[PDB]
Amino acid sequence: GRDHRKIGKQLDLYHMQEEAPGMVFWHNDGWTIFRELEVFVRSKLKEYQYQEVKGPFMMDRVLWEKTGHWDNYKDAMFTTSSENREYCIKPMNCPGHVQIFNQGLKSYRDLPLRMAEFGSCHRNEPSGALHGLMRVRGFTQDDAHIFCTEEQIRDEVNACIRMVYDMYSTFGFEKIVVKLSTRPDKRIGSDEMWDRAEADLAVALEENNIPFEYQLGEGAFYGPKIEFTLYDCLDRAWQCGTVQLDFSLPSRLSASYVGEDNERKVPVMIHRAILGSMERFIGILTEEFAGFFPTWLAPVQVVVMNITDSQSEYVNELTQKLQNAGIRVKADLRNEKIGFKIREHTLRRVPYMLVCGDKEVEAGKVAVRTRRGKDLGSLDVNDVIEKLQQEIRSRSLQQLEE
Amino acid sequence: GRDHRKIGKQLDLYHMQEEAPGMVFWHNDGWTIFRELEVFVRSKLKEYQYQEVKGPFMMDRVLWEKTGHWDNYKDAMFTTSSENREYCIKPMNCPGHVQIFNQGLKSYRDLPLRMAEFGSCHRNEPSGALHGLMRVRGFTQDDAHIFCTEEQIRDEVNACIRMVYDMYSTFGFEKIVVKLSTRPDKRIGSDEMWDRAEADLAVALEENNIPFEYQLGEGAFYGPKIEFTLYDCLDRAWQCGTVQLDFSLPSRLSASYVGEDNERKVPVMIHRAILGSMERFIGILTEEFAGFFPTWLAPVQVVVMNITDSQSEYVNELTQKLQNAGIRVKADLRNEKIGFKIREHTLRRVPYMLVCGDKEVEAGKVAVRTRRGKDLGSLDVNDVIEKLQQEIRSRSLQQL
Ligand SMILES: C[C@@H](O)[C@H](N)C(=O)NC/C=C/Cn1cnc2cc(Cl)c(Cl)cc2c1=O
Ligand SMILES: C[C@@H](O)[C@H](N)C(=O)NC/C=C/Cn1cnc2cc(Cl)c(Cl)cc2c1=O
Ligand SMILES: [Zn+2]
Ligand SMILES: [Zn+2]
Numbered sequence: 001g002r003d004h005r006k007i008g009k010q011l012d013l014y015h016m017q018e019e020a021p022g023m024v025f026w027h028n029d030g031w032t033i034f035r036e037l038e039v040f041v042r043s044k045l046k047e048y049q050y051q052e053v054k055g056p057f058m059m060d061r062v063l064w065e066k067t068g069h070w071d072n073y074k075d076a077m078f079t080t081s082s083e084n085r086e087y088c089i090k091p092m093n094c095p096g097h098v099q100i101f102n103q104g105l106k107s108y109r110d111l112p113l114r115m116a117e118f119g120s121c122h123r124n125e126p127s128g129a130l131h132g133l134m135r136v137r138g139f140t141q142d143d144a145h146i147f148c149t150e151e152q153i154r155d156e157v158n159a160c161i162r163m164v165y166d167m168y169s170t171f172g173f174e175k176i177v178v179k180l181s182t183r184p185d186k187r188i189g190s191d192e193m194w195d196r197a198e199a200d201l202a203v204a205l206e207e208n209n210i211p212f213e214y215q216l217g218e219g220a221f222y223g224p225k226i227e228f229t230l231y232d233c234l235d236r237a238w239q240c241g242t243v244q245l246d247f248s249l250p251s252r253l254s255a256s257y258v259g260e261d262n263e264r265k266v267p268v269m270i271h272r273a274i275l276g277s278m279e280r281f282i283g284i285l286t287e288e289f290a291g292f293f294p295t296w297l298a299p300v301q302v303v304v305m306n307i308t309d310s311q312s313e314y315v316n317e318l319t320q321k322l323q324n325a326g327i328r329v330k331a332d333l334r335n336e337k338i339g340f341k342i343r344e345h346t347l348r349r350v351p352y353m354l355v356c357g358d359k360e361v362e363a364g365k366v367a368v369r370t371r372r373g374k375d376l377g378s379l380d381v382n383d384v385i386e387k388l389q390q391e392i393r394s395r396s397l398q399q400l401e402e
Numbered sequence: 403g404r405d406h407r408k409i410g411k412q413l414d415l416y417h418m419q420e421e422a423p424g425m426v427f428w429h430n431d432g433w434t435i436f437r438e439l440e441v442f443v444r445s446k447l448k449e450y451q452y453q454e455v456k457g458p459f460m461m462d463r464v465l466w467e468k469t470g471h472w473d474n475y476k477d478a479m480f481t482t483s484s485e486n487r488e489y490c491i492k493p494m495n496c497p498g499h500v501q502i503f504n505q506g507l508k509s510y511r512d513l514p515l516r517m518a519e520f521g522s523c524h525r526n527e528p529s530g531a532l533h534g535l536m537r538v539r540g541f542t543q544d545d546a547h548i549f550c551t552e553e554q555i556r557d558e559v560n561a562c563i564r565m566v567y568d569m570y571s572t573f574g575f576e577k578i579v580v581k582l583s584t585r586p587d588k589r590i591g592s593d594e595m596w597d598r599a600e601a602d603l604a605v606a607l608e609e610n611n612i613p614f615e616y617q618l619g620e621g622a623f624y625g626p627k628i629e630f631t632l633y634d635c636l637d638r639a640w641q642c643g644t645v646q647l648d649f650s651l652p653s654r655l656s657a658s659y660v661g662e663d664n665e666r667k668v669p670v671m672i673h674r675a676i677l678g679s680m681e682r683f684i685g686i687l688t689e690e691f692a693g694f695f696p697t698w699l700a701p702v703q704v705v706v707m708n709i710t711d712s713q714s715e716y717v718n719e720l721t722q723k724l725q726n727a728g729i730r731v732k733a734d735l736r737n738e739k740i741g742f743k744i745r746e747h748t749l750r751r752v753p754y755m756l757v758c759g760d761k762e763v764e765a766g767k768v769a770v771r772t773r774r775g776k777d778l779g780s781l782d783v784n785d786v787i788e789k790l791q792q793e794i795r796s797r798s799l800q801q802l
Contacts, residue, residue, distance in 0.1 A: 015505050019465045020489070023458030025502055031456050054433050056425030056540055057459070057491075057524065058480075063421045078460075080482040080491060082526050087422075089459075089482065089491070100427055103417050120522070122459065124484050137484075138459050 002234070004286040005132045011291055011299070011349060014133070022130040022137030024279055029299035032328070033282060036297050038118060040170070040395065041142050041275070048163050050116040050144055055096030057120065058087040066252055067095055068222075076123050093119035094246075094271060097145045098253040101267075106257040111267065112152050116144035118278070133283030140278040146270040147255070153197070153268060157204035157226070157243060160272050164228050164241045165208075167274050171285060172397050175231035178205065178212035181219040188221055189247050197245050198224050222248035228274075232288045240281065244271040292371065295351040295388070296395045298328070302388070303345045304354045304366075305332040311356040318354065318366060318381060325385050327392070346371050351399060352388070368400070376402035404636075406688040407534050413693055413701070413750060416535075424532040424539030426681055431701035434730070435684060438699050440520060442572070442797065443544050443677070450565055452518040452546055457498025459522065463488040468654055469497055470623075480526050495521035496648075496673060499547045500655040503669075508659035513669065514554050518546035520680070535685030542680040548672040549657070552598075555670055559606040559628075559645060562674050566630050566643045569676050573687060574799050577633040580607060580614035583621040590623055591649055599647050600626050624650035630676075634690045642683065646673035694773065697753040697790070698797045700730070704790065705747045706756040706768075707734040716763045720756065720783065727787050729794065748773045753801060754790065772801050 001007065008014050013030030016023070026034055045052055061079065064070055069092075078089040090096065097115045106113070119141045129135055146156050168176060180201055183194045201224055205212050212226075219225055228241030246269040250256075259265045275281040285293070295301050304319045306312055315331050322329040332341050338355060345353050355367040359378070366384055368376040379402070387400055410416050415432030418425070428436060447454060460482065466472060471494075480491040492498065499517050508515070521543045531537055548558050570578060582603055585596045603626055607614050614628070621627060630643030648671040652658075661667040677683040687695070697703050704724055708717045714735050724731040734743055740757065747755050757769040761780065768786055770778040789802060 012506070015502075017501060019462040019501075020458040020460060021484075023460065024456075025458060025498065025505075026456040027502060027505070028453040028455060031454055034456070035454075051430040052433055053430060054426075054428035054436070056422040056427060057522065058422060058425065058540075060421040078482045078484065080480045082480070083529055096427065099419060099421070100417075100429060103427075103429070104414070120459065127485055 002287040002290050004134075004283045007286050007291040008133070013286075013299075016132070020138075021127045022125060022135065024133065024136065024138070030282070032299045033293065033297050034278060037275075037278060037282065040296075041118070041167075044163060044167060045116050045144075048114070048159060050114040052116050052118075053097065053100055054117060055090070055093060055100070055119065058089050059095065061086040061088055063095060063253075064088045068248060068252055076125065078122050078124050089122045090119070091121050091123045093117050093121065093141065093143045094145055094249060094269070095253060098250065098255050098269075101147055101255055102253070106147075106267075108149065108257060108260050108265075111257065112146055112148035112156055113267075114144060114146045114156075117141075119143045133279045133286075136277065136279055139280065141273050142275040142278060142281075143271075143273050146272070147250070147257075147267040148270065149265075150196070150268055153200045153245070153270070154204050154207075156270055157201060157245075158207055160243045160270065161204060161208050161210065161226075164243075164274050168228075168230055168241075170395055172288070173230040173232070175235075176210075177229040177231070177237065178210055179215045179227045179229070180205070180212050181215040181225045181227065182217060183224065184217045184219055184221060186221055187219075189223075193247065194224070197247070201226055201243070201245070220244065220246075222246045232284065234287075238284055240276040240284075241274050242272060242276070245269075246271055291349045293349065294395065294397050295399065296392045298349065298351050300330055300345075300348065300350050301328045301392070302352045302354055303330050303332050303341070303350050305338065305341045305345075305356065307338045307355065307357040310358060311361050314356050314361045318356065321381065321385060322354075322388075325389060327385075327388055342369060346373070354384070368402070370399050372399070374399075376400060404689045404692040406536075406685045409688050409693040410535075415688070415701075418534075422540075423529045424527070424537070426535065426538065426540070432684075434701045435695065435699055436680060439677075439680060439684065442698075443520070443569075446565060446569060447518050447546075450516070450561060452516040454518050454520075455499065455502055456519060457492070457495055457501070457521070460489040460491045461497065463490055465497060465655075466490045469651060470654060478525050478527060480524050491524045492521070493523055493525045495519050495523065495543065495545045496547055496651060496671070497655060500652065500657050500671075503549055503657055504655070508549075508669075510551065510659060510662045510667075513659065514548055514550040514558055516546060516548045516558075518544075521545045535681045535688075538679070538681055541682065543675050544677045544680060545673075545675050548674070549652070549659075549669045550672065551667070552670055555599075555602045555647070555672070556606055558672055559602060560610070562645045562672065563606060563610055563612065563628075565674075566645075566676050570630075570632055570643075572797055573690070575632040575634075577637075578612075579631040579633070579639070580612055581617050581629045581631070582607070582614050583617040583627045583629070584619065585626065586619045586621050586623065588623055589621070591625075595649060596626065599649070603628050603645070603647070622646065622648075624648045627673075632686075634686060636689075640682075640686055642678035642686075643676050644674060644678070647671075648673060693751045695751065696797065696799050697801065698794045700751065700753050702732055702747075702750065702752050703730045703794065704754045704756060705732050705734050705743075705752050706758065707740070707743050709740060709757070709759045711735075711737075712760065713758045713763050717758050720758065720768065723783070724787060724790075727791055729787075729790055744771060748775075756786070770802070774801065776801075778802060 223245035225244040229239045251266045306315045319331040353369045365378045367378050625647035627646040631641045652671050653668045658666045706717050706721050721733045755771045767780045769780050
C-alpha cells in the first residue's frame with residue numbers, strides 16, 4: 001500500500017490527535033527517519049557553503065507589521081500575549097534571519113551570505129483542510145536565505161537549482177516540472193528591475209539546461225520566483241521546491257552592508273526551500289517507497305537472528321560489530337522459528353535480515369536476506385559490514401546484489 | 403572576565419533582542435556548540451537505552467487542564483487561539499509523551515519504557531527577571547520520561563543517578579550537591595505510598611554513597627524528587643539535574659498497561675532532566691571555560707595557515723584531509739604576518755593552529771600551536787590527525 005497514514009500507524013512512525021490538529025507526534029522510528037533526513041540536508045548545507053542558525057519561536061507583532069505581510073496573512077498567524085505585548089508564533093524564518101544578519105557590521109566581502117535553518121513554522125490553517133503529514137499547521141522547513149548583491153543573483157540561483165535536482169535525485173525523483181512566476185499587477189520596484197530579476201531566473205535555468213514554463217502574473221509583489229514540482233512513481237505531482245527573489249524585506253527590516261565603493265547598500269534576498277516541509281516530504285517518501293525506506297533512512301536497518309539456541313552468542317558478537325560499525329541494528333533472539341522472525345521483520349520493512357545457522361557460525365559468515373524476499377547467500381561478516389556501510393554512506397536507493 | 407554575554411558576542415555565538423525577550427538567536431558557531439551538545443546527549447540516550455521522540459509545539463487547553471497544573475501555572479502559560487479553541491504552547495513535554503505512550507496496547511514486557519526528547523519549551527515569566535542564557539522564556543530541555551512499574555522504580559532511579567554523574571564528569575563538574583524533597587501538606591496518595599516513594603529515592607542515593615540533605619515539605623503533590631546542583635570553577639551553585647516521581651499524571655491522562663496478572667495497571671512516571679536547559683548549560687559551560695571550549699565543542703576546531711602563497715596548495719590539501727577525518731577546519735591563506743594570524747585565532751579560541759612553512763611542505767609535516775600558547779613543534783601530519791580525532795571522539799577536557 002501507499003497510504004502514509006496507514007503505513008505510519010503500521011510501522012509506528014507517528015500519530016496525530018484532535019487535541020493538536022495538524023501537528024505531528026513523532027514516535028521513535030519516525031523521528032529516526034526525520035533525523036537522518038536532517039543529517040542529509042546538513043551534508044548539502046556544508047557542501048553548498050551554507051551557515052546553519054536557529055531563531056526564536058516568537059517575536060513582537062510590531063516587528064511582523066513592518067515586514068509588509070501582515071495585511072495579507074494576519075488570519076493565518078497564531079498570536080500570544082505577555083505583559084501588554086503581542087507576539088506572533090513564527091510562520092516563516094526570514095525576519096529572524098534578517099535580525100541575525102543585522103548583528104555586526106556587514107561588508108561586500110561577507111556576501112553572498114547563505115543562512116539556513118530547520119525552521120519550526122506554525123500557520124493557523126483551517127482544521128477541515130488538514131490531512132495527515134501533507135497538510136499541517138506545525139511543520140519544519142528546510143529553509144534558507146541568501147543575502148547577496150544584484151550582480152551575484154544568477155550564480156546563487158544557479159547553485160539553488162543544482163542543489164534542488166541534486167537532492168531530489170537522492171530520493172529517486174528525476175521527473176521535475178519547473179514554473180517561473182512573472183510580475184503581478186500590484187508590485188514594488190521599477191519595470192527594469194523586474195526585467196533583470198526575471199531574466200536572472202530564466203538564464204539560471206537555461207545555464208542548467210532546464211526546460212520550464214511561465215506562471216504569468218503569479219509572482220509576489222516583492223519579486224519573481226521559480227517553483228519545482230517533483231513526480232513520484234505513481235506520476236503524481238508534488239510542488240516542493242521554491243526559489244523566491246525579494247527586493248522588499250531587507251529594506252523593510254533595515255538590512256544593509258558596506259559596498260566596495262564604501263557606500264551603504266541594501267542586499268537582495270533569495271528565499272529557498274527544496275524539500276518544503278520535512279513532514280510533508282517524509283509523507284511523500286513513505287508513499288513513494290511504500291514503507292520500504294532506503295537503508296540509510298530505515299528506522300531499523302538490520303536484524304541479526306539465530307535459527308536455534310546454538311547461535312545466540314554468535315548473534316550477540318555480530319550485533320555488537322554492526323553496532324560498532326554505526327548501523328542501526330537489533331538482535332532477534334526470541335524463541336521463535338526462523339520463518340516467523342523473517343516474516344515479522346519483512347512486514348516491518350527492515351532492509352536486511354542476517355540469519356545465523358551452524359554453517360554460518362562455523363565459517364565466520366552470515367546468510368543475508370532482504371525484505372524483498374531475496375536470498376543473497378552466505379557472506380563473510382567483515383565483507384557484509386563494509387558493503388552495508390557503503391550503501392549507507394552513499395545513500396543508495398538500491399540494496400545489495402547476489 | 404568570563405561573562406557568557408561578552409563571550410557570546412566576541413565569538414559570534416548568539417544574541418538576544420527586545421522583540422523576542424528571553425529567546426535566543428543562535429548564530430552559526432553557537433548553533434554548532436548546541437548541536438554537538440545534542441550529539442553528546444544522544445550518545446548517552448543510546449547507552450542508557452532511551453527512545454527519542456518529538457511532540458507538537460502546542461496542545462488543547464482542555465488536555466492541559468486535565469494534568470492538574472492549570473490552577474498553579476495558568477499565569478506562566480503562553481496561550482493562543484484557533485477556531486474558538488484555546489491552545490497552550492508547551493511549558494513541559496510530559497503530557498505529549500503520555501499521548502505517545504497511549505498509542506497502541508502496552509504490556510509489562512514493554513516496561514521500563516524510557517522516552518527522551520529535546521523538548522522546546524516556553525514559559526511566560528516576568529521579563530524584568532530575565533538575564534542572558536541563565537534565565538529565559540524559550541528553552542530546550544534534555545527531557546525524558548520513564549514509564550515503569552512500582553517494583554522497577556528503585557532500579558530506574560539508580561540508572562538516572564549514574565547518568566547524571568556520568569554526564570557532569572564529561573564537562574569537569576565533580577562537586578555535586580544533592581537534595582531530596584519529601585511529602586508536602588497538600589498531596590495525593592496514602593502516607594504509605596510516600597514512605598515507599600521517598601525510600602526509593604533515599605536508598606538509591608545511599609547505595610551509591612551520595613550524601614544528601616532533605617528538603618522537608620518541598621515535594622510536589624504527585625511525588626517526591628531528587629535535585630542535583632553542580633558547582634563551576636567560581637564555586638557558584640547551578641541546579642541543573644532533577645529526578646521526579648509521579649503517581650498522578652499517568653492516571654489523569656488515562657495511561658495504562660496490561661500487567662503480568664492480566665489486569666489494567668497505571669504506570670509510574672519518572673521525570674528527569676540532567677543538563678536542565680540546553681541554553682543555560684551552554685551559558686554555564688561558556689563561563690566555566692571562559693570561551694576555551696574543549697575541542698569537541700569548539701565551533702572551529704582547527705585553523706590551517708601558510709606563511710606565504712608558496713604553501714597554499716599544501717594547506718588546502720591538509721585542510722581537505724582534516725575535513726575527511728571529521729574535523730571542523732578552516733583554511734587561512736591571507737597575506738598577513740604569522741603573529742597576526744595566530745593571534746586572531748587564539749582570540750577566537752580555536753583549539754589548534756596548524757602552521758605550514760617551506761620546511762613543513764618538503765618534510766610532510768605541520769607545526770602545531772595551541773590557543774593556550776604551547777608550541778608542539780613540527781609533527782607528522784597523520785600523527786596529528788589521529789591525536790585530534792582521539793581528542794574529539796573521546797571528548798577530552800585537555801589538549802596535547
Ligand atoms: C522558502 C521560505 O524562505 C519562504 N519564506 C516560504 O515559506 N515560501 C513558501 C510560501 C510562502 C507563502 N506564504 C504562505 N503562508 C504564509 C503565512 C503567513 Cl502567516 C505569512 Cl506571514 C506568510 C506566508 C507566506 O509568505
Ligand atoms: C524533568 C521534566 O520532565 C520536568 N517536567 C521539569 O521540567 N522539571 C523541572 C520543574 C518544573 C516545574 N514547573 C515549572 N514551570 C511550569 C510552568 C508551567 Cl506553564 C507548567 Cl504547566 C508547569 C510547570 C512546572 O511543573
Ligand atoms: Zn523566507
Ligand atoms: Zn516531565
